[PDB]
Amino acid sequence: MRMPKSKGATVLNLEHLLEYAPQQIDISNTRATQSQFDTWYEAVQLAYDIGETEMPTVMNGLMVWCIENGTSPNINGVWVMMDGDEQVEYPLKPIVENAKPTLRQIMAHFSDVAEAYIEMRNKKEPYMPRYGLVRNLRDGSLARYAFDFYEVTSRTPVRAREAHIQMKA
Amino acid sequence: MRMPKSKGATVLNLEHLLEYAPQQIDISNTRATQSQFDTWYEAVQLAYDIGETEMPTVMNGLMVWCIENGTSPNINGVWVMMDGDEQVEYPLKPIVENAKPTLRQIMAHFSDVAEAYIEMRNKKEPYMPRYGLVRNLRDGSLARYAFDFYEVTSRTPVRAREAHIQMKA
Amino acid sequence: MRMPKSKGATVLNLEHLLEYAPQQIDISNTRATQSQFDTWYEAVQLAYDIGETEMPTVMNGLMVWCIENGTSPNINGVWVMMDGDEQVEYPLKPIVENAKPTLRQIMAHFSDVAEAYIEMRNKKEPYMPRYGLVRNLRDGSLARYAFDFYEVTSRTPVRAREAHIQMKA
Amino acid sequence: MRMPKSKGATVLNLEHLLEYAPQQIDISNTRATQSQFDTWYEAVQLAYDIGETEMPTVMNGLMVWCIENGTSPNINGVWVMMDGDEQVEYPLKPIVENAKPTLRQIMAHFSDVAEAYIEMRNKKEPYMPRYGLVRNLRDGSLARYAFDFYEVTSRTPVRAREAHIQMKA
Amino acid sequence: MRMPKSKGATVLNLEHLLEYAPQQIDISNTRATQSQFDTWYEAVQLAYDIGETEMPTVMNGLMVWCIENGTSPNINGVWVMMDGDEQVEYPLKPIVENAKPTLRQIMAHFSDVAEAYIEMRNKKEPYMPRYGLVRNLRDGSLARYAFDFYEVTSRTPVRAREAHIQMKA
């Protein structure tokens, strides 16, 4: 093999070269960077006039809303939260404006947790996310992966990779 | 797994995260929100000069009309109600103007009840909604699902999902 | 045979003609020339204000970043390095501007080493570069070749040649 | 690179230039200078016979008026303030006079605050400034940029830059 | 080939022509000559009553002003310097006078240094000169070329050549 050279010197080290072991999600372009996610968090927090005691509760339903309604909604719209049987409405402009590059990449930070919620739902009655009810997904084991902000990593079953290709087609 | 992080703190809670259990129809974009449905109700009520004693009766036939004539009609038109053998006419502009985002989403609040009416009809003589007589649906058990404002949830038989895909194609 | 002639004289020699034995990568247009790589190295070094003691470490992650995120990114963007659990951000404009003719050819100097890193990763948990998770590559032995700046030489297995044709299609 | 030279000596420090980091709005010709704004403030104060206890209230209504009626009005005209349900009438020549170079540049000092007021109005009922209701702007998210005295800096989203080009055309 | 001839004798050495290798900027008409620049320097120095200890600081702000406000301003105007938070006001006729042929050609001597300042600003927050924010330049990499007194030589990337043609159109 040949290691990169510049003016007769190696430019890629020898020890740390075979020691750097990052995580796939961290250095991937499918999700927004940590700085971008932080900016989106406070911008949404400042727009809704919510403190640090109710904001975690509010963001629980936004992830659930994006499971069943996607991550590319109309800006001039609203997304719903339910406190009991009442539909509590929130403006959707702050969610999208302050999300860079796209809301899907920002929502991709919720990929791991969103499967836990769907698996919970798939313990009482069959629950299939709408994103999979419009692309004709019949499997009941792939319901945990039927949201548009899912991150495909090197831990995803092969059937799921084919399903997302079929879904997005 | 990794839960969303912002400035070294979890932003998705731990207990209410695995307790929020909404209903699919409530947080879905296939139907208008409760506020939107309320606005459409009074706007139509105020346009027809009807009180709270005949309006429930009038809206019974509007749902039946939309079963057999769809939810995307010409605004400058009329929809018919039958009191005995006489065709009582109502303007159709108030139904569509005041419906946001679309009349189909507003009519989607009648998805559950519209199946009860069709099943009633399918107890004396075979009744197939027109929306299914123009897309060549031959099954007699799918007649209860042959209206354009049907809501596909995680309780719909798999054959029905294929039928609507075939119908809308 | 006929050897090139000009004014009644051979113009291709006889001894050194059958002695010149270059290497395929050196005289190939799939990678930038040594002068071009040197210019890109110092230009990136001068833009980041880094000496000759940390620059080899920084370029380790840029190669890893290009494995999972390609070699044609948006100039007005950033690429991430991880020191522990923190995302250290670098501007991406110096990487692309000063790379001639393209960053893929400049990154092609890292083709040999990038396989060593992937093979390392493929010793603890299955690691498939993202560039192969979006083109539906299922083989686990071709993971070492699933980056866009791979150089196809006369040492590459035949299956790999077909895979890259299928991947790039 | 080459420095500017005069009689064999450098004419630029290039050490304080590294220090020199002015703000874009301060050294821009899109807004009047601080001295010009001070002249306009006192002259308007002297024309309306108002002290330093009601003038801050007075200029609150002037900024809102320029949002909905532009910054190029007739000199022989009036601008309206509302105290309750009554229209308080103010002469408009004191505004369009003593405002150099133009009233738009003087009004550009209110660009930041004018967006806070618009974002306030877009929390109860949809509010689009009349400047955007005559140029066919159908995106309510861009309502915060629909005043002619908006200042385009290097913090404006790319959407707003295209919208203003479309509006001013 | 044919040499220029006069009375049966060559009029060109063609041995010193091989020696003659001038710089493109030096013998270009896009910038004022050295004598013209020296005249503009002393005349501006004599007009502002400033010595040789503060003038290098003074011209630092003038170059930045021309980046964001162009090199064709009104003679009966002022250009702003910032010492801290205060706007220092300077007359602008001493600048647009004693600057022949044009101020742009005089300002062209700062083309190399003006890019260093812009590249400095594009290290903390995105900074695009106002010259490019009014001509719809959406590429932040080309921010280093977004001043009207830029000199196009045979070292400018092909991107910048097309951008300036698009901008000046």
Numbering used by the authors:
A (entry chain Ag), B (entry chain Ai), C (entry chain Ae), D (entry chain Ah), E (entry chain Af): 54 to 222
What does the paper say about this structure?
Potyviral CP plays a role in virtually every step of the viral infection cycle, from transmission of the virion by aphids, virus assembly and disassembly, regulation of genome amplification, protein translation, to cell-to-cell and long-distance movement. CP consists of a highly conserved globular core flanked by two large extended regions with a high frequency of structural disorder. The C-terminal high intrinsic disorder region (C-IDR) is partially conserved and packaged in the lumen of the virion, supported by the helical ssRNA scaffold. Here, we show that we can control the shape, size, RNA encapsidation ability, symmetry, stability and surface functionalization of nanoparticles through structure-based design of CP from potato virus Y (PVY).
We have previously shown that truncation of the N-IDR at G40 results in an insoluble protein, whereas CPΔN49 and CPΔN49C40 with both IDRs truncated, self-assemble into single octameric rings and their short stacks. To facilitate sample preparation for further structural analysis, we attached the His6-tag to the C-terminus of CPΔN49C40 (trCP). Cryo-EM revealed that the affinity-purified sample consisted predominantly of trCP double octameric rings assembled in a head-to-tail (H2T) orientation. In wild type VLPr filaments, the N-IDR is responsible for the axial connection of the octameric rings, with no obvious interactions between the core regions of the CPs. The truncation of N-IDR reduces the axial separation of the rings by 3.9 Å and shifts the twist angle in H2T double rings compared with VLPr filaments. The blob of density in the center of the two rings, which was already observed in the 2D class averages, was assigned to a cluster of His6-tags, because it was absent in the 2D class averages after the removal of the His6-tag, which also led to the dissociation of double rings into single rings. The octameric ring exhibits pronounced charge anisotropy, with positive (P-side) and negative (N-side) charge predominating on the opposite surfaces, which explains the ionic strength-dependent size distribution of the self-assembled particles.
